[PDB]
Amino acid sequence: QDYQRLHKESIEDPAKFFGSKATQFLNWSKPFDKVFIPDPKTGRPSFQNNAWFLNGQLNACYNCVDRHALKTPNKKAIIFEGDEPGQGYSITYKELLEEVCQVAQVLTYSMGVRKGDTVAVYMPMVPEAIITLLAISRIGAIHSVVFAGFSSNSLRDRINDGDSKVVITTDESNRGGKVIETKRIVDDALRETPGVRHVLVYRKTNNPSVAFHAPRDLDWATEKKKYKTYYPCTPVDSEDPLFLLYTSGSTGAPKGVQHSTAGYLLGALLTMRYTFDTHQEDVFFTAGDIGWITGHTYVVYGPLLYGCATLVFEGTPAYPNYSRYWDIIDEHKVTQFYVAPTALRLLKRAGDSYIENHSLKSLRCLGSVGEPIAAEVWEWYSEKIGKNEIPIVDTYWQTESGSHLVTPLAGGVTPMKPGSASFPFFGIDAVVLDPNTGEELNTSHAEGVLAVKAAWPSFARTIWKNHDRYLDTYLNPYPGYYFTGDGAAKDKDGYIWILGRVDDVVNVSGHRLSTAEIEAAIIEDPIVAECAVVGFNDDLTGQAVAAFVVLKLQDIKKHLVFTVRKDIGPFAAPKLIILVDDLPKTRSGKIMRRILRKILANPGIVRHLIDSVKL
Amino acid sequence: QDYQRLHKESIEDPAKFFGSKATQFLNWSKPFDKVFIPDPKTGRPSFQNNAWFLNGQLNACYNCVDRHALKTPNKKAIIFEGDEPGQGYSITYKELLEEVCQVAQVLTYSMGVRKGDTVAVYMPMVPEAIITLLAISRIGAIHSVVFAGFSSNSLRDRINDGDSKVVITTDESNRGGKVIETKRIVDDALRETPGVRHVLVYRKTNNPSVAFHAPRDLDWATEKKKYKTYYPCTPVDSEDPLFLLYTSGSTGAPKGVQHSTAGYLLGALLTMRYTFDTHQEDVFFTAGDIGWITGHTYVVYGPLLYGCATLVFEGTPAYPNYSRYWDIIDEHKVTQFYVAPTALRLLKRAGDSYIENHSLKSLRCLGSVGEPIAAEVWEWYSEKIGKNEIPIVDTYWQTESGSHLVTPLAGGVTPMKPGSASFPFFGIDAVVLDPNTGEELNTSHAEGVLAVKAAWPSFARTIWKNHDRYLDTYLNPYPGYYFTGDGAAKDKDGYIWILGRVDDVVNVSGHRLSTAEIEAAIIEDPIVAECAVVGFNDDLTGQAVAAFVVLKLQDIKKHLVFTVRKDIGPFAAPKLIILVDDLPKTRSGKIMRRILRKILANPGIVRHLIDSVKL
Amino acid sequence: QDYQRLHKESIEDPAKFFGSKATQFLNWSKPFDKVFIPDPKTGRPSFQNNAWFLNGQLNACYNCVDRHALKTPNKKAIIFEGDEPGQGYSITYKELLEEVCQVAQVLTYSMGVRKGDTVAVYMPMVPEAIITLLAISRIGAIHSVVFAGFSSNSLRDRINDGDSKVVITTDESNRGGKVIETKRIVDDALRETPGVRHVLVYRKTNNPSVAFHAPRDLDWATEKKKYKTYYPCTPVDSEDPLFLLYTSGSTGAPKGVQHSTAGYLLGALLTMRYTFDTHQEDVFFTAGDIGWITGHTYVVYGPLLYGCATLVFEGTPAYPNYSRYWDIIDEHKVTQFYVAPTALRLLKRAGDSYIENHSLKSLRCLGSVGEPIAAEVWEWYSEKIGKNEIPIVDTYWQTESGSHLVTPLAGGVTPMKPGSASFPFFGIDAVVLDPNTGEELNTSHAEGVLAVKAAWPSFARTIWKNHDRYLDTYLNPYPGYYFTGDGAAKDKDGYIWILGRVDDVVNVSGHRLSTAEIEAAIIEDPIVAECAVVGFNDDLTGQAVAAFVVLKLQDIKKHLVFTVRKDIGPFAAPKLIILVDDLPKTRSGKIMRRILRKILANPGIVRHLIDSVKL
Ligand SMILES: Nc1ncnc2c1ncn2[C@@H]1O[C@H](COP(=O)(O)O)[C@@H](O)[C@H]1O
Ligand SMILES: Nc1ncnc2c1ncn2[C@@H]1O[C@H](COP(=O)(O)O)[C@@H](O)[C@H]1O
Ligand SMILES: Nc1ncnc2c1ncn2[C@@H]1O[C@H](COP(=O)(O)O)[C@@H](O)[C@H]1O
């Protein structure tokens, strides 16, 4: 009965629900006055003026490190695993404290950072990346992480929009067995970033005469050794920005999504205890770069705020072989695996031969995030990896949500449906609206746009320097609710099914076809292992269905077409399928269908996709 | 007591014994009148006019497919395993039915084949080879299979003697990791086959501009897709030829051994139930090409007639490594392994390191066929592979016998002797005759020529187009009996020991030395792993013993000589041993000693053997 | 209570203790009159005139082979393992007898060796090396083994000093996967050995036109085949030399340490039964070349005298991979592993990944010999290899001691201390003396020079041809006792700790710093895996501490320095650490610190060490 009460308590009485959790899970410097700013029009937390734990003061880094060093100093906080097998090591909580303290002082004294500044972070998945981020919040600064792979052009714009006067990177990065010049990329970018005063560089490889030029550049080791190991934290208000995270999804100048401190931290805590049923002696492993909210909230914040161990792997699922991912899971007794479908799709390709010897009884929970997960792949995940006896939480949420939106509970929710994300998390009032006829709440089993009626604490507060794009994008499209950008439907039993962003929905003769269903049914064919249905500027017929299929010399298309009508319908069967080797994806994993749309196709994926359509 | 009765019932009262089994195991279109044509001179089935189930009508393909598709449509019929590991797949009985039906129609409508025509088959061990053969009998045609390795010169003669107006092959064949141009070989051959009207080609690799020329050549896929999936069978008389199989053993124009339909099919059924104790849920694996009776009767007919699953592996025991044979046995839970000694001789060389991890508790029976099996190799087979707790049937029989001649019963016969084939199968009256003084039946423990007193149903009926060679070869050498061509002896306890074809017996001073005993004792020495004793045009001394030994710089011969006298005798010890790297063998496995005789040595084996004798 | 009595019995009443064991463990031809020659000055066995089992007659080879062939002829004596995996084989005791008998006759009749001659042996670890040695004692000859790796210059001098008129070698030696020209090395050496009459060569590889020239050179196989398989032994007096073993340690013309027959043989027997608790059905594996006493006493004499099986491996611990050492231990069910720390140091580097699958429950005892063994390496040895449930005897002894000096008993001694060798063996009266103020016996817990008060039977009797060096080296430095050359100390509980040869002790301001403690503490750091502290001609300060550290770009030295003071003291922390890739070691394993001293650095190790000091 837990979920039924706890969720209603969080919806009709958030003050009591979150007020209590807020004092429970976090250590405060100054108690908060009010829990949230309501919507006077008789309502829950206001969307326009969303704000939680008013006048309250606390410190992220203090909650992620200090309190645990002063309790379980000898317990491990970070468990690292290099790109190469035996190159790992752990960092106790006591030592992380020391490290984050020398770095906090490096920032204040060597670089001149103050409370409120934007610190840009361009690093790979190594411990120093993590302590860097904690060092930034320890001093009341706001970190802005950029994927350690993005072009120097991407780096520049993000720093310029971010107001970042300083930067933090490495000299090079060995990924999946491939070195990557980051310091190089940093310099090309700084040829156009006027406000960059300093650049802290953590030599990871011992560079091949990599640039380093004046008092601008500083050495991580050189500077660290200068400061004591303990440094006092900087209290900040509950509603002061914790960080910024430039989301790089759709077209249009990247958005600097801004998150609160308390509110965001409480969500990461609530989701750890309920969603993953995390304890203190756990070993959480989130296979996602610090480049996206996944890595922010589940490979750094959630785990460290809770006080358990979080695993940092700077490598790839295929390096040095597909058994690698599972080799590091059984030696570290990882109790929490959390990865994206793309990865779970490539591992399922290599064959359960690499999973053979692995007993991996160390796991207790599995999780999926990033995009829809087909049923056969969910089953495969549930049986091969999970040895079918351990939960699987397919977590629905966004960079803006901060934390899980709708997800199954590792324990609270007894049942589970392979393509569903089960139920809305606590505080989230998920409803399905009619995309056409206003913001009408669809009650009976039906498909429509997903939204939340009231705001919650972990909800992003704005978009860096322009609260206008924020409103138009998230609150103006469907006045009164929050616009997720995705389509969904609740089955007879209430479960929620994510249809895959109704922005890529192909409307054939007024039918609106969501991608989730059509593509999953495709990939779920021995002939394929990945599918992507899109569209293009179409005059007549309204809009046709074209599928870019990728196999694992004739009439091979027709089959995949007659199978679409076999279970989905004849008005869903594509008018043309294109055979491609792969699909244009983001470092995150998501498939860029807007690229398949825009034009029928600049990475190598482009050209090959520029030809696989002409003929 | 089973064997004692059942065998006597089948000898003194075959009418009742086989008449009953005949109605039990096979589905008939029109009941047979008489069981067999006796020998009026008071006797069992006549040899000269051998004929069973008179006036009866049935259909092979119907008995191998239909009846089982209409009972257990979802059960697997063929389990394939490509030359490369994970390239396998299964064919249910329902689907095999569909396939064999489209192909039957391809033969009738696209190629013009009629009931009675000879269809030549030149294919590798792939499913299509199997459905092709079934397609041929479904329409009352007679299939003539030729080894997918034989020269184009071999192909031509076999087709010309066979009267084959059509052919069936692939474009190329990847064997043991080596592609083989078959379509090439087919074309060189058809430059001399005047009566070849059509050629059906199943593109297996997607050829590198392989020939295909006029309405003569037809595509398997192109043609198949044209016909419905169900096609009616063609009833044929019990005594109408099922197939022809050109035996390529001794010198002299290859013989087109012709087998009946009913009679041959009943033998394959009797031998499955008793010899292998096969059920319905079994997975039978016969490691022998469709090129010889072994593959006809135990990798196609026996298994499919019984209704279980038969495994089709188109690869080699050494590819991609010696563990391969056992890798496919444990995943498919093969319950019946049946292979030849040559293979069991090369696997025993690699060391029980490849058999280590393998539990292979899926097996229930082991079998040996092809040639004599030494004791140490039988033991090795019995202990390493069999984990000594599962039977081993060393099956004695020929292309002419159709089915097992003398063999141990997987259950019926409680004891077993490593170099013996135990007892004569039901219906077979095996006796040992004196090679010199007439057809005298030797009763007491002694060695002599093997023969059968009366005929049985699975006995070949003739030799294509010349019943004269048939008589001289099989029935005239020892009037009244059937001349096996081998030597044997029954021990005190009755077991029968095959001496290895008394046609290669070296008679030293009137002693007649069979090869079985002398060679087994040789190979059974750590210094060797294969031996071949023969002879040559010898004037004085009568005939000497020369052994071509192959190891796994002096006085190394003498040893192997003093060891021959140690257990066999000083008049058996060879006068000269030749050290060769290997021996001239047939695609079947048998060692060609008549080549070592003929001349002291055209494949590479020739030249090297042309020198290893001069010096 | 066993050890307490047995040891006191052997000290205050050796006549009864050893007299009884002497008749028990050895078969005599003529009983011995007196047990030992005492020191008239009221004492135990005299040092100056040490002699045991007077007037007694026996035969080594008879005690190592014969008696066991005439009891358990079918039991295995030698279990060989080539450098390449599956190239092994065993030699029963019956066959070893035959072999040692044909070789004894080869020596007498083909080469002219007589009782008393010195036979030089230059061979690798192959059976023939072992039978050669036994063949030599069988005829009353004295064998002088030289490492199959030493230069031809080393071979010459050892033969010249040895008086060796004959030699025994192979043509080449495949070691660790590297062929080694020995016959080559033998010939260069014999260009200066005037008294060499013959050279017996056992062709191991079948040479690439390797030299062999006149009646001087003889073939092992050619000669062996000439003699019967049984040949009578030659009785020799208890005190007649068994062998000579040129120790190649410190500087100065190599010493030909001469051992008795009976006395040495009894020690090897006593040490097997008590130290290793050996039985008859055991499989002893001593990983040490026949080049040093270890191989003499524990890979030949001890095992063969006892009547069990001894394993002969002619390969390297790293070939063909680090799992090799353990691969041969589980297949042969080795019950006794005995190796040197250098090896145990390189195997511990590869990671317990090669030890994973290995169950190796066949072991019953582990042993360490050669040099001090750090605690972490002892633990690693005790837990990974021993699966912590099997004893570990860190055996202290020298080439001169013949057999164990102070060691733990596989069973008799219940406790064990990782860096201790426990207690003095029976007959050995170990005491700690003051290096400065005379031969004062230190009683209370303190550090000093190790010595033995009375002699024992296995004690070397002299140094070939110059009993003068013998006295000055072993009995004159500390009159009355035996000078081991090492430093030690007994802890509160009596255990003895070897400090590492007080000849390499760095005396900083009158402190005398033994290497054992300082280096073990160093290597016991994740940053290193091998350490070597030495010194050099130092005027002021007295003598500084310089450590040559080898890792598994600044302030890396300081750490290892602050750690030295952390547990040992600030007056032990080195004044300078040198970073080298490896250390100059002897084929035995011992680290040559006198080379690091002599000069701050001819094998490749020299040059690199000649530079790693200048800068
Ligand atoms: N568990 C999930 N199932 C289906 N879609 C998901 C899931 N998690 C995230 N998404 C989609 O991915 C987007 C979030 O991307 P991002 O902001 O980069 O984390 C949303 O718009 C969702 O539609
Ligand atoms: N199990 C067996 N033991 C000994 N010889 C056999 C065995 N099976 C077949 N043969 C021999 O192989 C010949 C049959 O060859 P084939 O007609 O090609 O099957 C016969 O002449 C037999 O002598
Ligand atoms: N178990 C041991 N522990 C410490 N040092 C040892 C040990 N065994 C032998 N040694 C040293 O090695 C030397 C003997 O070398 P060797 O004569 O070649 O066997 C002695 O001087 C000892 O100091």
Coordinates of N, CA, C and O in Angstrom, one line a residue, chain C residues 42-122:
Chain C
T42 N 85.9 -31.4 25.7 CA 84.5 -31.7 26.1 C 83.6 -31.0 25.1 O 83.3 -29.8 25.2
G43 N 83.1 -31.8 24.2 CA 82.2 -31.2 23.2 C 81.5 -32.1 22.2 O 81.6 -33.3 22.2
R44 N 80.7 -31.5 21.4 CA 79.9 -32.1 20.3 C 80.8 -32.4 19.1 O 82.1 -32.3 19.2
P45 N 80.3 -32.7 18.0 CA 81.1 -33.0 16.8 C 82.1 -31.9 16.6 O 81.8 -30.7 16.5
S46 N 83.4 -32.3 16.5 CA 84.5 -31.3 16.2 C 84.4 -30.6 14.9 O 83.9 -31.2 13.9
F47 N 84.7 -29.3 14.9 CA 84.6 -28.5 13.7 C 85.9 -28.8 12.8 O 85.7 -29.0 11.6
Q48 N 87.0 -28.8 13.4 CA 88.3 -29.0 12.7 C 88.4 -30.4 12.1 O 89.0 -30.5 11.0
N49 N 88.0 -31.4 12.8 CA 88.1 -32.7 12.3 C 86.7 -33.4 12.1 O 86.6 -34.6 12.2
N50 N 85.7 -32.6 11.7 CA 84.4 -33.1 11.5 C 84.4 -34.4 10.7 O 84.9 -34.4 9.6
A51 N 83.7 -35.4 11.2 CA 83.7 -36.7 10.5 C 82.6 -37.6 11.1 O 82.6 -37.8 12.3
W52 N 81.7 -38.1 10.3 CA 80.6 -38.9 10.8 C 80.6 -40.4 10.2 O 81.0 -40.6 9.1
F53 N 80.1 -41.3 11.0 CA 80.0 -42.7 10.6 C 81.3 -43.4 10.2 O 81.3 -44.0 9.1
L54 N 82.3 -43.2 11.0 CA 83.6 -43.7 10.7 C 83.6 -45.2 10.2 O 82.9 -46.0 10.6
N55 N 84.6 -45.4 9.3 CA 84.8 -46.8 8.7 C 83.5 -47.4 8.1 O 83.5 -48.5 7.8
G56 N 82.4 -46.6 8.0 CA 81.2 -47.1 7.4 C 81.3 -47.0 5.8 O 82.0 -46.2 5.3
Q57 N 80.7 -48.0 5.2 CA 80.6 -48.0 3.7 C 79.2 -48.1 3.2 O 78.4 -48.9 3.7
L58 N 78.9 -47.3 2.1 CA 77.6 -47.3 1.5 C 77.7 -46.7 0.1 O 78.8 -46.4 -0.3
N59 N 76.6 -46.7 -0.6 CA 76.6 -46.1 -2.0 C 75.5 -45.2 -2.2 O 74.3 -45.6 -2.1
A60 N 75.7 -44.0 -2.6 CA 74.7 -43.0 -2.8 C 73.7 -43.5 -3.8 O 72.5 -43.7 -3.5
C61 N 74.1 -43.8 -5.1 CA 73.2 -44.3 -6.1 C 72.4 -45.5 -5.6 O 71.2 -45.6 -6.0
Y62 N 73.0 -46.4 -4.8 CA 72.3 -47.5 -4.3 C 71.1 -47.0 -3.4 O 70.0 -47.5 -3.5
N63 N 71.4 -46.0 -2.6 CA 70.4 -45.5 -1.7 C 69.4 -44.6 -2.4 O 68.2 -44.5 -2.0
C64 N 69.7 -44.1 -3.6 CA 68.8 -43.2 -4.4 C 68.0 -44.0 -5.4 O 66.9 -43.5 -5.9
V65 N 68.4 -45.2 -5.8 CA 67.7 -45.9 -6.8 C 67.5 -47.4 -6.5 O 66.3 -47.8 -6.2
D66 N 68.5 -48.2 -6.5 CA 68.4 -49.6 -6.3 C 67.4 -50.1 -5.2 O 66.4 -50.7 -5.6
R67 N 67.6 -49.8 -4.0 CA 66.7 -50.2 -2.9 C 65.2 -50.0 -3.2 O 64.4 -50.7 -2.7
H68 N 65.0 -48.9 -4.0 CA 63.6 -48.6 -4.3 C 63.1 -49.4 -5.6 O 61.9 -49.6 -5.8
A69 N 64.0 -49.8 -6.5 CA 63.7 -50.5 -7.7 C 63.3 -51.9 -7.2 O 62.5 -52.6 -7.8
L70 N 64.0 -52.4 -6.2 CA 63.8 -53.7 -5.6 C 62.7 -53.8 -4.6 O 62.5 -54.8 -3.9
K71 N 61.9 -52.7 -4.5 CA 60.8 -52.7 -3.6 C 59.5 -52.2 -4.4 O 58.5 -53.0 -4.5
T72 N 59.6 -51.0 -4.9 CA 58.5 -50.5 -5.7 C 59.0 -50.2 -7.1 O 59.1 -49.0 -7.5
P73 N 59.3 -51.2 -7.9 CA 59.8 -51.0 -9.2 C 58.9 -50.2 -10.2 O 59.4 -49.5 -11.1
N74 N 57.6 -50.4 -10.0 CA 56.6 -49.7 -10.8 C 56.2 -48.3 -10.4 O 55.5 -47.6 -11.2
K75 N 56.7 -47.8 -9.3 CA 56.4 -46.5 -8.9 C 57.3 -45.5 -9.6 O 58.5 -45.9 -9.9
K76 N 56.8 -44.3 -9.9 CA 57.6 -43.3 -10.7 C 58.6 -42.6 -9.8 O 58.4 -42.3 -8.6
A77 N 59.8 -42.4 -10.4 CA 60.9 -41.8 -9.7 C 61.1 -40.3 -10.2 O 61.2 -39.4 -9.4
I78 N 61.2 -40.2 -11.5 CA 61.3 -38.8 -12.1 C 60.1 -38.5 -13.0 O 59.7 -39.3 -13.8
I79 N 59.5 -37.3 -12.7 CA 58.4 -36.9 -13.5 C 58.9 -35.6 -14.2 O 59.1 -34.5 -13.6
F80 N 59.2 -35.7 -15.5 CA 59.7 -34.6 -16.3 C 58.6 -33.8 -17.0 O 57.5 -34.2 -17.3
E81 N 59.0 -32.5 -17.2 CA 58.1 -31.5 -17.9 C 59.0 -30.6 -18.7 O 59.8 -29.8 -18.2
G82 N 59.0 -30.8 -20.0 CA 59.8 -30.0 -20.9 C 59.6 -28.6 -20.8 O 58.7 -28.1 -20.1
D83 N 60.3 -27.8 -21.6 CA 60.1 -26.3 -21.6 C 58.8 -26.0 -22.2 O 58.1 -25.0 -21.9
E84 N 58.4 -26.9 -23.2 CA 57.1 -26.7 -23.9 C 56.1 -27.6 -23.1 O 56.4 -28.7 -22.7
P85 N 54.9 -27.1 -22.9 CA 53.8 -27.9 -22.2 C 53.8 -29.4 -22.3 O 54.6 -30.1 -21.6
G86 N 53.0 -29.9 -23.2 CA 52.9 -31.4 -23.3 C 54.1 -32.1 -23.9 O 54.0 -32.7 -25.0
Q87 N 55.2 -32.1 -23.2 CA 56.4 -32.8 -23.7 C 57.0 -33.7 -22.5 O 58.1 -34.1 -22.5
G88 N 56.1 -33.9 -21.6 CA 56.5 -34.7 -20.4 C 56.4 -36.2 -20.4 O 55.9 -36.8 -21.4
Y89 N 57.0 -36.8 -19.4 CA 57.0 -38.2 -19.3 C 57.6 -38.6 -18.0 O 58.3 -37.8 -17.3
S90 N 57.4 -39.8 -17.5 CA 57.9 -40.3 -16.2 C 58.9 -41.5 -16.4 O 58.8 -42.2 -17.4
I91 N 59.7 -41.6 -15.4 CA 60.7 -42.7 -15.3 C 60.4 -43.5 -14.0 O 60.6 -42.9 -12.9
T92 N 60.0 -44.7 -14.1 CA 59.8 -45.5 -13.0 C 61.2 -45.7 -12.3 O 62.2 -45.3 -12.8
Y93 N 61.2 -46.4 -11.1 CA 62.5 -46.6 -10.4 C 63.2 -47.7 -11.1 O 64.5 -47.7 -11.1
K94 N 62.5 -48.6 -11.7 CA 63.1 -49.8 -12.4 C 63.9 -49.3 -13.6 O 65.0 -49.8 -13.8
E95 N 63.3 -48.4 -14.3 CA 64.0 -47.9 -15.5 C 65.1 -46.9 -15.3 O 66.1 -46.8 -16.0
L96 N 65.0 -46.2 -14.1 CA 66.1 -45.3 -13.8 C 67.3 -46.1 -13.5 O 68.4 -45.8 -13.8
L97 N 67.0 -47.3 -12.8 CA 68.1 -48.2 -12.5 C 68.8 -48.6 -13.7 O 70.0 -48.6 -13.8
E98 N 68.0 -49.0 -14.8 CA 68.6 -49.5 -16.0 C 69.4 -48.4 -16.6 O 70.6 -48.6 -17.0
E99 N 68.9 -47.2 -16.7 CA 69.6 -46.0 -17.3 C 70.9 -45.7 -16.5 O 71.9 -45.5 -17.2
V100 N 70.8 -45.5 -15.2 CA 72.0 -45.2 -14.5 C 73.0 -46.3 -14.6 O 74.2 -46.0 -14.4
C101 N 72.6 -47.5 -14.9 CA 73.5 -48.6 -15.1 C 74.3 -48.6 -16.4 O 75.4 -49.0 -16.5
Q102 N 73.6 -48.2 -17.5 CA 74.2 -48.2 -18.8 C 75.2 -47.0 -18.8 O 76.3 -47.1 -19.5
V103 N 74.9 -45.9 -18.1 CA 75.7 -44.7 -18.1 C 76.9 -44.9 -17.2 O 78.0 -44.4 -17.5
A104 N 76.7 -45.7 -16.1 CA 77.9 -46.0 -15.2 C 78.9 -46.7 -16.0 O 80.1 -46.5 -15.9
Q105 N 78.4 -47.6 -16.9 CA 79.3 -48.4 -17.7 C 79.9 -47.6 -18.8 O 81.1 -47.9 -19.3
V106 N 79.2 -46.6 -19.3 CA 79.7 -45.7 -20.4 C 80.9 -45.0 -19.8 O 81.9 -44.8 -20.5
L107 N 80.8 -44.5 -18.6 CA 81.8 -43.8 -17.9 C 83.1 -44.6 -17.6 O 84.2 -44.2 -17.8
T108 N 82.9 -45.8 -17.2 CA 84.0 -46.8 -16.9 C 84.7 -47.3 -18.2 O 85.9 -47.2 -18.2
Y109 N 83.9 -47.8 -19.1 CA 84.4 -48.4 -20.3 C 84.7 -47.5 -21.5 O 85.7 -47.7 -22.3
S110 N 83.8 -46.5 -21.8 CA 84.0 -45.6 -22.9 C 84.9 -44.4 -22.6 O 85.6 -43.9 -23.5
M111 N 84.8 -43.9 -21.4 CA 85.6 -42.7 -21.0 C 86.7 -43.0 -20.0 O 87.6 -42.1 -19.8
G112 N 86.7 -44.1 -19.4 CA 87.8 -44.5 -18.4 C 87.8 -43.8 -17.1 O 88.9 -43.6 -16.5
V113 N 86.6 -43.5 -16.6 CA 86.5 -42.8 -15.3 C 86.7 -43.9 -14.2 O 86.2 -45.0 -14.3
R114 N 87.4 -43.5 -13.1 CA 87.6 -44.4 -11.9 C 87.1 -43.8 -10.6 O 86.8 -42.6 -10.6
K115 N 87.0 -44.6 -9.6 CA 86.5 -44.2 -8.3 C 87.4 -43.1 -7.8 O 88.6 -43.2 -7.6
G116 N 86.8 -41.9 -7.6 CA 87.6 -40.8 -7.1 C 87.8 -39.6 -8.1 O 88.1 -38.5 -7.6
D117 N 87.6 -39.9 -9.4 CA 87.8 -38.8 -10.4 C 86.7 -37.8 -10.3 O 85.7 -38.0 -9.7
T118 N 87.0 -36.6 -10.8 CA 86.0 -35.5 -10.8 C 85.3 -35.5 -12.2 O 86.0 -35.3 -13.2
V119 N 84.0 -35.6 -12.2 CA 83.3 -35.6 -13.4 C 82.5 -34.3 -13.5 O 81.7 -34.0 -12.7
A120 N 82.9 -33.4 -14.5 CA 82.2 -32.2 -14.7 C 80.8 -32.3 -15.4 O 80.8 -33.1 -16.4
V121 N 79.8 -31.7 -14.9 CA 78.5 -31.8 -15.5 C 77.9 -30.4 -15.9 O 77.8 -29.5 -15.0
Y122 N 77.7 -30.2 -17.2 CA 77.2 -29.0 -17.7 C 75.9 -29.3 -18.4 O 75.9 -29.5 -19.6

